[PDB]
Each structure stands twice: as structure tokens, then as C-alpha cells.
Amino acid sequence: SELLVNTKSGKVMGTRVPVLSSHISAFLGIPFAEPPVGNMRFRRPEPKKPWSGVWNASTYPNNCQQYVDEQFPGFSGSEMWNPNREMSEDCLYLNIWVPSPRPKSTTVMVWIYGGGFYSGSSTLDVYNGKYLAYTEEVVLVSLSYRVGAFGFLALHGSQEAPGNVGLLDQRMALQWVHDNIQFFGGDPKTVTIFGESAGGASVGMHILSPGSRDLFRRAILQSGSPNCPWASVSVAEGRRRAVELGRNLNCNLNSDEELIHCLREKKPQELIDVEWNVLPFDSIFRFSFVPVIDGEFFPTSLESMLNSGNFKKTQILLGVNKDEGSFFLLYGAPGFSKDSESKISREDFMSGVKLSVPHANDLGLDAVTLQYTDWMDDNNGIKNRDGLDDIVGDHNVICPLMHFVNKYTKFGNGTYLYFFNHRASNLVWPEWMGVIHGYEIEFVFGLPLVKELNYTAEEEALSRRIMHYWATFAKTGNPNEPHSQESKWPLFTTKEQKFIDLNTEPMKVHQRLRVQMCVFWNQFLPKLLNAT
Amino acid sequence: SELLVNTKSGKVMGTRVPVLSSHISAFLGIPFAEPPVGNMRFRRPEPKKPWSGVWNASTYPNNCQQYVDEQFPGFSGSEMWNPNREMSEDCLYLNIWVPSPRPKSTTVMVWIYGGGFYSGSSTLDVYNGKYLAYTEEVVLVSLSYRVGAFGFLALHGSQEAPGNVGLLDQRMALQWVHDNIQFFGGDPKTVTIFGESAGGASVGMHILSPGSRDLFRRAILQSGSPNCPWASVSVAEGRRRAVELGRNLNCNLNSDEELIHCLREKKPQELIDVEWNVLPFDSIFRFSFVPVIDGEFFPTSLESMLNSGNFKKTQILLGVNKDEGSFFLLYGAPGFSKDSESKISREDFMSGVKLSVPHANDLGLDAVTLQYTDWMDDNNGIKNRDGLDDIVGDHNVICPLMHFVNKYTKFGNGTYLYFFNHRASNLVWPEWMGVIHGYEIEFVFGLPLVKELNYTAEEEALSRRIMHYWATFAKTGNPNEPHSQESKWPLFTTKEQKFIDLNTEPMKVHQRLRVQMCVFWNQFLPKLLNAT
Ligand SMILES: *[C@@H]1O[C@H](CO)[C@@H](O)[C@H](O)[C@H]1NC(C)=O
Ligand SMILES: *[C@@H]1O[C@H](CO)[C@@H](O)[C@H](O)[C@H]1NC(C)=O
Ligand SMILES: *[C@@H]1O[C@H](CO)[C@@H](O)[C@H](O)[C@H]1NC(C)=O
Ligand SMILES: *[C@@H]1O[C@H](CO)[C@@H](O)[C@H](O)[C@H]1NC(C)=O
Ligand SMILES: [Cl-]
Ligand SMILES: [Cl-]
Ligand SMILES: [Cl-]
Ligand SMILES: [Cl-]
Ligand SMILES: [Cl-]
Ligand SMILES: [Cl-]
Ligand SMILES: [Cl-]
Ligand SMILES: [Cl-]
Ligand SMILES: [Cl-]
Ligand SMILES: [Cl-]
Ligand SMILES: [Cl-]
Ligand SMILES: [Cl-]
Ligand SMILES: [Cl-]
Ligand SMILES: [Cl-]
Incomplete structure (x- = not known):
């Protein structure tokens, strides 16, 4: 069946969606990682364990836990950016729009949402990929990744909360696309990653990171670059903010182990409620938990990498x-x-x-x-x-x-x-x-x-x-x-x-x-x- | 006689000069100070001793010793600014153009030539005051003052070469105008001093200096202000340049007395030949010997005087x-x-x-x-x-x-x-x-x-x-x-x-x-x- 696709992770059943007096196939909410819940909070993502049976990919997945804009209640201008699904830490899923009939080996585009690394959802109406997939006849994928403290809390040196895990979520989704998009009619050797704002900075970060380069062909960056002043912090500043977050939640700060343990016991909203209190300055266009220059995902400073040509x-x-x-x-x-x-x-x-x-x-x-x-x-x-x-x-x-x-x-x-x-x-x-x-x-x-x-x-x-x-x-x-x-x-x-x-x-x-x-x-x- | 005027310093006989199909009286080369020669070099000017008989004021005086522009020989653009009279240290004279018939009590304007404090003459064709005096019916005076090391060598602390003597020359001429212009038909209570470049900076310096304020009514500054970066130096820098000048002339630098003695033995051209070698930087629009912020002519820094309203x-x-x-x-x-x-x-x-x-x-x-x-x-x-x-x-x-x-x-x-x-x-x-x-x-x-x-x-x-x-x-x-x-x-x-x-x-x-x-x-x- 056109809506049935067998992947290396298992079978998935999509849904036929209408688009401009025509139709295309949509596979929504495909898991690409194990739910980063419990003791998995702050930790690097782990591949989704293959499943038996058919995964129902007919509806959008939950959105990752995040701060919600309530500055203008009832105003579409701001609310169109808020989560339109229920929020949950179990949020690592991707969506795929496929032309009908199913292509054999066509161009693939993977969308990475923005939101200053503190917000964002792959399910927003403005990100509905059916128009682009249909009109340009491409396989359009939209991934998801943890934002805020959940995706970027950084206590360098620790393996429980190393930082940059939201970027690793993105990479895992790209890895899944590399490994499985062929079954949906997409060409894994012709994948373009594109994103806006923090999503644009992310695209640039994958161009830079040796661990991400092999997973895509070309890139598009909209209103964002890896070197933006708000897009990353030093390991020292990241550590300072993680400790300050713990301080806001009356956490034992004697060690990373104790701090992380405490943060993991808190409900998602408890972290979100104090997230903005850790900024070092009275500022605008500065976000609390963002990528960290760790010496791993980013071998050296962004500027030295750019100068030396150390990038894809x-x-x-x-x-x-x-x-x-x-x-x-x-x-x-x-x-x-x-x-x-x-x-x-x-x-x-x-x-x-x-x-x-x-x-x-x-x-x-x-x-x-x-x-x-x-x-x-x-x-x-x-x-x-x-x-x-x-x-x-x-x-x-x-x-x-x-x-x-x-x-x-x-x-x-x-x-x-x-x-x-x-x-x-x-x-x-x-x-x-x-x-x-x-x-x-x-x-x-x-x-x-x-x-x-x-x-x-x-x-x-x-x-x-x-x-x-x-x-x-x-x-x-x-x-x-x-x-x-x-x-x-x-x-x-x-x-x-x-x-x-x-x-x-x-x-x-x-x-x-x-x-x-x-x-x-x-x-x-x-x-x-x-x-x- | 219209050309004969008796002043407090003695009698002067001018000459009738033609101007735009008419005529006016000109009294050229009137001495206002004792010749600053010999042991009087670098020292404050002294009033001209009254003379017996009639002083012939029918011809322009000598120009003060100064560097001469030879960059474009035969070119009027540059040569029109060079001395058009013989140069001599005996150069403290002033010129007066008087309407005919002689006025009773008319507006007086006193011109102060510019030239970066290193050059200038009151006798240039471009400074011929007969047109202005005739046309506007004012008594027009042009004074002179020592320039270069002769007028601004500064060894603060010494009374033999205190610095600012060129400015004191200007003041003495203004004093003479205050004391005698009434006899030429000018009104001493309605004197306007005006000058260009270094002359403009000078006008501003007299507005500032308590010792000059009472000698004029109003002022005009053309392309120059007392605070220009090239118009003055600190007592320390002035001292450094005086010593460097001596060093250029193989002078004994053991004391101000020895240094000054040596400099006074040198012919005028010897000082002029090395004048530009004392500048601290490779620069343009910077001149060697200029006014010094001495705490006397200028009570305090120019900026503090301007801020406090300490000026005329x-x-x-x-x-x-x-x-x-x-x-x-x-x-x-x-x-x-x-x-x-x-x-x-x-x-x-x-x-x-x-x-x-x-x-x-x-x-x-x-x-x-x-x-x-x-x-x-x-x-x-x-x-x-x-x-x-x-x-x-x-x-x-x-x-x-x-x-x-x-x-x-x-x-x-x-x-x-x-x-x-x-x-x-x-x-x-x-x-x-x-x-x-x-x-x-x-x-x-x-x-x-x-x-x-x-x-x-x-x-x-x-x-x-x-x-x-x-x-x-x-x-x-x-x-x-x-x-x-x-x-x-x-x-x-x-x-x-x-x-x-x-x-x-x-x-x-x-x-x-x-x-x-x-x-x-x-x-x-x-x-x-x-x-x-
Ligand atoms: C989920 O899959 C089932 C098939 O078992 C289908 O009936 C349902 O419509 C899909 N999504 C919904 C609406 O729950
Ligand atoms: C891109 O690389 C190819 C060789 O792989 C070269 O022929 C082409 O000129 C390059 N294009 C640009 C704009 O650098
Ligand atoms: C100087 O004054 C004398 C009068 O004694 C006069 O003859 C002469 O023309 C004046 N100037 C000159 C030309 O030397
Ligand atoms: C100048 O001072 C007089 C008083 O002496 C005053 O009447 C006049 O307004 C002042 N003019 C200006 C422009 O300050
Ligand atoms: Cl539609
Ligand atoms: Cl809108
Ligand atoms: Cl509007
Ligand atoms: Cl640039
Ligand atoms: Cl710690
Ligand atoms: Cl703050
Ligand atoms: Cl703010
Ligand atoms: Cl004429
Ligand atoms: Cl010209
Ligand atoms: Cl020309
Ligand atoms: Cl200004
Ligand atoms: Cl000395
Ligand atoms: Cl130099
Ligand atoms: Cl030069």
C-alpha cells in the first residue's frame, strides 16, 4: 500500500492528506529516538528500539516541553508560534510528506525549526510541509529536538548532562533520514537541511561539526548562523547557568551528580518557570540554554574552525x-x-x-x-x-x-x-x-x-x-x-x-x-x- | 596736516595712497615695541621708547624672521604667503589705514595674520587694508608678532624664554591701539580684533587671557580657534622642543641659562634651518613653536576656562x-x-x-x-x-x-x-x-x-x-x-x-x-x- 512503508526500525502507516485540489502521503509522528525521560533527561539521545507491528503515523506527535508565549493572549501573531499539541518530554519524532505516487529517488529537504533554542515545534501550521512537497515534488521531513534546559543544560565534564543534546537529537533524526528515507522514495545522497533562526544556526553547526557533516548534501540557513552571539556559550558560562538553575530550585549544589539528580526530580514546568532567571545580564535576544563550545561537537572555537576551513x-x-x-x-x-x-x-x-x-x-x-x-x-x-x-x-x-x-x-x-x-x-x-x-x-x-x-x-x-x-x-x-x-x-x-x-x-x-x-x-x- | 599725527609715542607722517579712483591715508611701519634683538631674543616685548622728531610711516616695515615656502618656486599660489619684505628680528611694527578726511571717532578693526605661528607677515598684498578701510569707512590696523622659535620658544620657569612672547607682541600692539588710535580718528572703545588660522586662534586666546580682555570690544575668528590641536602645547612639551632645538644646534644643555645663551648666539636662519626637526611625530598640521599653556597668559587649561566661563x-x-x-x-x-x-x-x-x-x-x-x-x-x-x-x-x-x-x-x-x-x-x-x-x-x-x-x-x-x-x-x-x-x-x-x-x-x-x-x-x- 502507498501508505505502508517498511523501515529499518519497523513498519509505519501514514495518512492521505488533501492539498490544493490533490493529495499526498503524510507520515506523522515517527519516533527516531528513545523517549528522553526520567534518568534520560539531559542525556544524549539513544536510537529508537525497532518495533514490531505497524506504527500509526496518521497524527502529529507531542511537542517538546517549553516556555509558552502568553504575552498577547488570543493574538494569532504570537500564538501561531506556541505548541499546538500537548507538551511532553517524550517528543523526539519526525514528520514526512511524500508526493503521490511515491517517488523512487527524489530530492529530500529536512526542516529544523527555530525558536532561540528555548522553544519550537515541528507541528506548527506554518511548517505544514504538504504544500512544498506537493508543489516541488520533494520528500519533505521536519524533525524535532529538545529545547531549553532539557536540550541544552550544560555541565561540561559530566556524561549525564554534557550539553548540546538538542543538537544530538537533530543529528539522530538526520541519521534516521540517511538510513531510511530511501524507503519513502527519497534520495539519501541528496538531502538538504534547512532551518530558520536557531534552526539556521543549527544547520550551520552541523556544517561545522565533524560528527554531522556526512549526514546531508547541502544546506540552507534562514535568519541564523552558528556564530550568532545568542547561539552558543562557553563551557564555563553554561556551567554557571546550570548551577544558577539549581539554585533557583533549591538544589544541592555540592556536586554535578547531586545537582543533576535534583534537576531530574523536578517536573518539566518547574524548570521552565525559572529558566529566564539564569541570564547574566539585563538583555534582549539572549536565551538561557543554548549550544556550548565543548571541544567535542565543536572541536575548537567557531571562529578558528571558520578561519581554518574546518567544516563541510x-x-x-x-x-x-x-x-x-x-x-x-x-x-x-x-x-x-x-x-x-x-x-x-x-x-x-x-x-x-x-x-x-x-x-x-x-x-x-x-x-x-x-x-x-x-x-x-x-x-x-x-x-x-x-x-x-x-x-x-x-x-x-x-x-x-x-x-x-x-x-x-x-x-x-x-x-x-x-x-x-x-x-x-x-x-x-x-x-x-x-x-x-x-x-x-x-x-x-x-x-x-x-x-x-x-x-x-x-x-x-x-x-x-x-x-x-x-x-x-x-x-x-x-x-x-x-x-x-x-x-x-x-x-x-x-x-x-x-x-x-x-x-x-x-x-x-x-x-x-x-x-x-x-x-x-x-x-x-x-x-x-x-x-x- | 592730514598725514601728520601726534601720538603718545611721538609724531608720525603717513602717505596718501590711491584706492578705487579715490584716496586714503596710510601710516605704515609704526613701531610699537623695542626691537627684540640680541639679549632681547625670546624675551617678553618692551614698549617702544618715545621718539623725538617725525617717524616716516610711508613704507611697509620688515617682516619677522621665518621659514620661507620654496616648495613651488615661481608659483603665486604659495609665494603670495611668503615675506614680501626683507626679514629681520627688528619686526615689531603695525600699519594703519585711515579714511580721508580723517574720522573723529570711528570703528577700528585690527588684523592678526595667521601662518601656523611659524610664518606670516602684515605686509602681504592680500592683507592690504586700503580697500576695507575705504569701502567700509573704518580705521584698519594690521599688527605683527614674532613667529617660530623667536616668538614661541618655551622654557617654562625661565624669564629669559618664558614662551608666548609672540602673543605678548600682539597684546602690546593692541595696547598701543588702545592708547593711540584716537589720534587717527579711531574709537578705542569700539575695536574689533580679527584674524585667520593662527590669527584666529590668537583672537580666541586674547578672549581667554585676563591680560588681554580689556584691550578690545569684540572679535572675529576665521578658520581658527584657541583649542585647535596645533595651536598650543603643554609646558613639558614646549620645554622638550626647546631642548631638542638646542640639541640640533650643538648647544650646551646643562641648564636653561646655557641653552638660551647658545640659542641667542645663533643667526636667525640657523634656528629656522632646524625648526621642523623638533616635532614629536611624523605628522601634518603640527607646528614646532606655538603658544604654551603656562598658567600665566592662560590661568588654567583652555577647556576648564571654556567650561567655567572664564573668558571675555x-x-x-x-x-x-x-x-x-x-x-x-x-x-x-x-x-x-x-x-x-x-x-x-x-x-x-x-x-x-x-x-x-x-x-x-x-x-x-x-x-x-x-x-x-x-x-x-x-x-x-x-x-x-x-x-x-x-x-x-x-x-x-x-x-x-x-x-x-x-x-x-x-x-x-x-x-x-x-x-x-x-x-x-x-x-x-x-x-x-x-x-x-x-x-x-x-x-x-x-x-x-x-x-x-x-x-x-x-x-x-x-x-x-x-x-x-x-x-x-x-x-x-x-x-x-x-x-x-x-x-x-x-x-x-x-x-x-x-x-x-x-x-x-x-x-x-x-x-x-x-x-x-x-x-x-x-x-x-x-x-x-x-x-x-
Ligand atoms: C491511529 O491508527 C488507527 C489504526 O489502528 C486508526 O484507526 C486511527 O485513525 C489512527 N489515528 C487516530 C485517529 O487515532
Ligand atoms: C565546485 O566544485 C567543482 C569540483 O568538484 C568545481 O568544478 C566548481 O567550479 C566548484 N564551484 C564553485 C562555485 O566553487
Ligand atoms: C621716508 O621719509 C622721507 C622724508 O624724510 C621721504 O622723503 C621718503 O619718501 C620716505 N620713504 C622713503 C621713500 O624712503
Ligand atoms: C547681550 O547683553 C544685553 C545686556 O547687556 C542683553 O540685553 C542682550 O539680550 C544680550 N544679547 C544676547 C544675544 O545675549
Ligand atoms: Cl490546501
Ligand atoms: Cl500575520
Ligand atoms: Cl496591523
Ligand atoms: Cl562582514
Ligand atoms: Cl557542581
Ligand atoms: Cl540580571
Ligand atoms: Cl527585557
Ligand atoms: Cl585700487
Ligand atoms: Cl589663486
Ligand atoms: Cl587650476
Ligand atoms: Cl561640537
Ligand atoms: Cl635645561
Ligand atoms: Cl619624528
Ligand atoms: Cl609630512
Whole structure:
């Protein structure tokens, strides 16, 4: 039967799902690891033990335990990102959308959700892979991984809570795809991993980690890079936060053994309730439990690996959105509100700068302030607001990604860069937030093709073009079709550094994405902070 | 007789000079101090001993001993600034142009020549005061003062070479004007001192020095301020340079007495021949012997005086030119040449930055480089050239003047600011140099009114408007005529900070002159250099 597939782990029975007046096969909630529960909390994942009989893969799995956004109850803009399934530590499953009839050996794309490593679900409506699988005829997989303390609590030296286990969850899912996707009609030698935000940083981390490189062919990074300031911490800082978490839960801190034992006795929500109390600074765009530079998953520092070419050399497609920082300013910076234009005073601008670059000394803060202040009109509330927005986006996403692309391209086999600046016509968030962190995803997954979602004809066209760019890149390593009549997305080279905008207007090629600000963030500021 | 005037120092006989189809009286070469020769070299000036008989004031006096520019022999652009009279240490004289018939009690303007404190003459054709005196009907005086080691060698603690004697020369001339100008028809209570470059810095220094304040009514500063980085040195640095000068002349350095004795035995040219060898850094826009912050002429640091309002409170009119730095880049920066467009490579740009900000550490140099580099087009030779030009002008003239104007205006009684950006139609210097340091002077002195000089009709008009602004300001403290129909030059205020451009186009009012760069030079960079 088309819905019955026999894998090395056992048989699975999918379900026939409708999609754009047609149908495709969906295998939802396939386990790829043993439930990381009980004494398995914080520990590396273990392969799922093969099962007898048929596994019912007709419904989505549970979502991993995580902090839930309740800042705007009843508001779809925020709630569309929250878990839409019941949360459980038993959450290591993957979903597969397969074209009908079942392909023989077709391109595979594996989605890695974002969420700052503290949240995320593979089951969100915005991640429904049926449109992309159907339209581009690819086998689309979405995996899952532990987030928060459950996936990243790090007490280096310990084998019970070594850190990075969420990344190992991702790897195990990729391993399962490598070992079994052939049975679903997918080609294991042509797998493209793609993800947004923390998912994009993760994709980059697998490109770097020797233990992950052999599990995929090429990669796509959306609004995230392995070197982002929020994407990793040192083993020392990771240890400090784990201890502080224990301190928040009245744990015995005499030893790792005692600490871990205590943390394992706590209910999931107990850890989540104090998770944000372990941050070292009053900040925004900084998350508690994230990957740790351990000397194992990451042999050496990310920068030395990038400089020495110690990473998988293949083709990559990546990019950023126009206003990556607006979301986090709304949630944690003074002067910003969801229902106002959020014009910011010079006072709130300064406060915002300090929250955005928490690790900087006063000289560093002065440098940032001067770099983003128009002294001919310093009390302009709109300029102050947009300036802070740019600071947050440049520092946390754009400039780190630009540093990554330039370093990677020196050793890589092909780079394609984009700048997504289309503000959706049906966005529920205020206009001041612009092109928000994560809002290119709906276009990548083809939501604009669904009439009921209220997108414009132009937006359906943009989505189809994006899905085709992504799928063609996954299939060939080039988003452009051979001998096509359409505008060509040029290769990003060390010399010309070209990129294209992604919007409803005719294609435009540019060079040196935000180079002026990124020289500040990537070269000058770090030098200043190190000298002072 | 109209040409005979009896002063407190004795009688003087002037000469009738032609000017624009008319005539005026000129009293040239009037001594105001005893010749600072022999054992009087380096020492404070002494009042000129009254003389019997009639002093012949029909011809210009000698020019003070100074370095002579021989970089472009036969070229008027450079030679017009060199001494046009024989050089001698016996050079403390002043010149007076008086309207005919002799006024009774009219506005007086006293010119203080510039030249980086290492050069300058009151006798240059460009300083001929007959046009201004005639046209605006003011008594115009041009004084002189010792420059170079002769006027600024400083061995603090010694009374034989205390430093600042060139400034004391200026003061003595102002004292003479205060005591005698009434006999020439000038009003001693309505004297305006004005000067360019080092002359502008000097005007500001007299505003600051308690010993000079009572000698004038108001002031005009052109392309120079007391706080310019090249305008003064500490007593320690002044002492170091005096000793180094002696070292260059094989002097006994065992004591100030021995050093001074040796220096006094040397011929003038011997000192001049090694004057430039005492600079501490490889630099441009830095001169060897300049005013010293002695605790006498200047009670405390210039900045503390400015902050505390420890200065003469009156009205001031001041401004700068568009390209103040081009001249010094031509003479000392790599890549610049008089007969080429001087497009500069990134390499020469970096070298130029280091020469322009000699006191900065590498971090500081990086800060300047980033502030003036367009990273979207960093190899643009024209942008690099103009960028360096701006760095030199901003750092050495504009930003220091802007810091002065903002500090002064808080306590002053009226500030008028200008930005001179007119490139003369008959300029002999290359186009790349733009509106050069010192080239607004010819307009202030009315040279464009002389048909034979080849200026345009528009330039004659601009000159007349400038001369009238200057003279009206000197007369009333406001460059605008009461109940006039012409555009009004607004008062510069702490809040609106308005200024006007000075060119052949209709008046335009602007605000916050080069505020973005000046915040960098006046606030950020100093903080960076002090923290590192
Ligand atoms: C799970 O599999 C069973 C078959 O045993 C099927 O009837 C059911 O619809 C599947 N999912 C649900 C709705 O529980
Ligand atoms: C990618 O590698 C192949 C050889 O494996 C080479 O022919 C090709 O030029 C490379 N492409 C780029 C853009 O580096
Ligand atoms: C100096 O004064 C004398 C009068 O004794 C006069 O003849 C002469 O022209 C003046 N200047 C010159 C030309 O030496
Ligand atoms: C200057 O001072 C006088 C009082 O002496 C005052 O009336 C006038 O307002 C002041 N002008 C400015 C611009 O400060
Ligand atoms: Cl549908
Ligand atoms: Cl411990
Ligand atoms: Cl805190
Ligand atoms: Cl916050
Ligand atoms: Cl970069
Ligand atoms: Cl929306
Ligand atoms: Cl809205
Ligand atoms: Cl004439
Ligand atoms: Cl000595
Ligand atoms: Cl040197
Ligand atoms: Cl030089
Ligand atoms: Cl300023
Ligand atoms: Cl000229
Ligand atoms: Cl020319």
C-alpha cells in the first residue's frame, strides 16, 4: 500500500492528506529516538528500539516541553508560534510528506525549526510541509529536538548532562533520514537541511561539526548562523547557568551528580518557570540554554574552525529579513508597545542600546550609539525606533551571518545570498515592526497558495518563486533552473559579494549586504571591547 | 596736516595712497615695541621708547624672521604667503589705514595674520587694508608678532624664554591701539580684533587671557580657534622642543641659562634651518613653536576656562572654509601632488590618516578610518582623497571651532557663524583642493573689487557683502543692518545652532555645522583615546 512503508526500525502507516485540489502521503509522528525521560533527561539521545507491528503515523506527535508565549493572549501573531499539541518530554519524532505516487529517488529537504533554542515545534501550521512537497515534488521531513534546559543544560565534564543534546537529537533524526528515507522514495545522497533562526544556526553547526557533516548534501540557513552571539556559550558560562538553575530550585549544589539528580526530580514546568532567571545580564535576544563550545561537537572555537576551513564544503543558500530585531524589542525594550507606533525618545534609545549589547562597556555603548544616531535629528522618535531595530537585527542576525558567509565562501563550493524585505499584506503585527524575524517562513512553506489565508496574487507568485528557488537548490546546488528565461540569482563570490532581494518586485542584484554596519560589528567593536 | 599725527609715542607722517579712483591715508611701519634683538631674543616685548622728531610711516616695515615656502618656486599660489619684505628680528611694527578726511571717532578693526605661528607677515598684498578701510569707512590696523622659535620658544620657569612672547607682541600692539588710535580718528572703545588660522586662534586666546580682555570690544575668528590641536602645547612639551632645538644646534644643555645663551648666539636662519626637526611625530598640521599653556597668559587649561566661563563675554563672528585640510595634505601626505587629481589609494588613505592624527593609537586610527570610509566603494580614489581632506579639516579646524562656539555661546553676548564654500574663479591651485585654508581672506579684504585681479562680478558682490558684514559687526556687534531688506544672518544659539553659507548664491540658513563628524572628534575619539 502507498501508505505502508517498511523501515529499518519497523513498519509505519501514514495518512492521505488533501492539498490544493490533490493529495499526498503524510507520515506523522515517527519516533527516531528513545523517549528522553526520567534518568534520560539531559542525556544524549539513544536510537529508537525497532518495533514490531505497524506504527500509526496518521497524527502529529507531542511537542517538546517549553516556555509558552502568553504575552498577547488570543493574538494569532504570537500564538501561531506556541505548541499546538500537548507538551511532553517524550517528543523526539519526525514528520514526512511524500508526493503521490511515491517517488523512487527524489530530492529530500529536512526542516529544523527555530525558536532561540528555548522553544519550537515541528507541528506548527506554518511548517505544514504538504504544500512544498506537493508543489516541488520533494520528500519533505521536519524533525524535532529538545529545547531549553532539557536540550541544552550544560555541565561540561559530566556524561549525564554534557550539553548540546538538542543538537544530538537533530543529528539522530538526520541519521534516521540517511538510513531510511530511501524507503519513502527519497534520495539519501541528496538531502538538504534547512532551518530558520536557531534552526539556521543549527544547520550551520552541523556544517561545522565533524560528527554531522556526512549526514546531508547541502544546506540552507534562514535568519541564523552558528556564530550568532545568542547561539552558543562557553563551557564555563553554561556551567554557571546550570548551577544558577539549581539554585533557583533549591538544589544541592555540592556536586554535578547531586545537582543533576535534583534537576531530574523536578517536573518539566518547574524548570521552565525559572529558566529566564539564569541570564547574566539585563538583555534582549539572549536565551538561557543554548549550544556550548565543548571541544567535542565543536572541536575548537567557531571562529578558528571558520578561519581554518574546518567544516563541510558544499553549496549553501542563506539570507536574512529586513527587520530581524523588532520582535525582541517589542517584548523587552522600553518605549515599544504592540498597539502604538512606538516612537522612541533618546532616553529609551540609550536604554535599548544597553539591553541590545549587554556585554559592552560604556565606551562600547557610546560607539554603538554614535554609529546609529543621526545627530542632525537626534530627537526623531521614528529614527530612534528604526535605529534600535537595526542595531538589534544587525548585531544578532545580519552581521553574524555576513561574517559566516564571507568566511564560508572562501572554502565552499557555491553560495547564494538573499535579503527578504516583503511586508505581508495580511500581517497582524503593527507596521513599525516591518519584516519580522521568522516571517519569510510562510512563503518558504507556500502558505500564500491557500486562498483562505488572504494573501495577494503577487504574494502567491513570490511564494512559488521562493519554493522553487529552495527546491531547485536542494536538487542541484543552484536555485536557478538551467537554460531558464527568468532573472538569474547570481552566485555570491568573495570578490563581488552579490545578493538579491526577495520581494514582489522584479529581481534586483546588490552587493555587500549592510557592509558599513557589519564592519563595525564584525571588526571595530570587537577590537574596541578587547582593548578596553 | 592730514598725514601728520601726534601720538603718545611721538609724531608720525603717513602717505596718501590711491584706492578705487579715490584716496586714503596710510601710516605704515609704526613701531610699537623695542626691537627684540640680541639679549632681547625670546624675551617678553618692551614698549617702544618715545621718539623725538617725525617717524616716516610711508613704507611697509620688515617682516619677522621665518621659514620661507620654496616648495613651488615661481608659483603665486604659495609665494603670495611668503615675506614680501626683507626679514629681520627688528619686526615689531603695525600699519594703519585711515579714511580721508580723517574720522573723529570711528570703528577700528585690527588684523592678526595667521601662518601656523611659524610664518606670516602684515605686509602681504592680500592683507592690504586700503580697500576695507575705504569701502567700509573704518580705521584698519594690521599688527605683527614674532613667529617660530623667536616668538614661541618655551622654557617654562625661565624669564629669559618664558614662551608666548609672540602673543605678548600682539597684546602690546593692541595696547598701543588702545592708547593711540584716537589720534587717527579711531574709537578705542569700539575695536574689533580679527584674524585667520593662527590669527584666529590668537583672537580666541586674547578672549581667554585676563591680560588681554580689556584691550578690545569684540572679535572675529576665521578658520581658527584657541583649542585647535596645533595651536598650543603643554609646558613639558614646549620645554622638550626647546631642548631638542638646542640639541640640533650643538648647544650646551646643562641648564636653561646655557641653552638660551647658545640659542641667542645663533643667526636667525640657523634656528629656522632646524625648526621642523623638533616635532614629536611624523605628522601634518603640527607646528614646532606655538603658544604654551603656562598658567600665566592662560590661568588654567583652555577647556576648564571654556567650561567655567572664564573668558571675555562679548559678541563674536566666526567661521570656517569647506576644505581647510587640502593644503597640508598636498605638502606632506603620500599620493597628493599639485599637478594631478591626487586620487588616493586605500594604502595612501591609511598612511594619511596616521599623519593626520599622530597622537592616536591603532584603535583610534581604526575609529577614524571607519568614520570616513565608504565600505561600499572603498577603492574610490576620489572618495579617499576627499575623505582625507575632510579628516584633516574636521580634526584641525572645523570641529575644534565648533567646540569653541558651543562653549562660548553659553556665556557670550552674541554669536554669528559662517561656512565659506566659494571656490574663486581665478584660483591657481588645482580643483581637488577646493576652498583652501586662507582663501576667504582675499574676499574679506576686498581684492575682488580690483578689476585687474580677474574676479567675476558675482565675486565682487560677495566680497562687498562680506566686508559689510564684518564692518557692521565690528561697529554694532551684529553683521546685519537695522531695518535692512537683505536676507538676515541669524544669531547662532545654543538651541538652534544656526549658521549661513558664504558664497555667490542667495543666502541659505543651516543648523549644526558638521555635527555628525564633530561629535566623533569632540566626544567619542577623545574618550576612546583616554580609555585605551
Ligand atoms: C491511529 O491508527 C488507527 C489504526 O489502528 C486508526 O484507526 C486511527 O485513525 C489512527 N489515528 C487516530 C485517529 O487515532
Ligand atoms: C565546485 O566544485 C567543482 C569540483 O568538484 C568545481 O568544478 C566548481 O567550479 C566548484 N564551484 C564553485 C562555485 O566553487
Ligand atoms: C621716508 O621719509 C622721507 C622724508 O624724510 C621721504 O622723503 C621718503 O619718501 C620716505 N620713504 C622713503 C621713500 O624712503
Ligand atoms: C547681550 O547683553 C544685553 C545686556 O547687556 C542683553 O540685553 C542682550 O539680550 C544680550 N544679547 C544676547 C544675544 O545675549
Ligand atoms: Cl490546501
Ligand atoms: Cl557542581
Ligand atoms: Cl540580571
Ligand atoms: Cl527585557
Ligand atoms: Cl562582514
Ligand atoms: Cl500575520
Ligand atoms: Cl496591523
Ligand atoms: Cl585700487
Ligand atoms: Cl635645561
Ligand atoms: Cl619624528
Ligand atoms: Cl609630512
Ligand atoms: Cl561640537
Ligand atoms: Cl589663486
Ligand atoms: Cl587650476
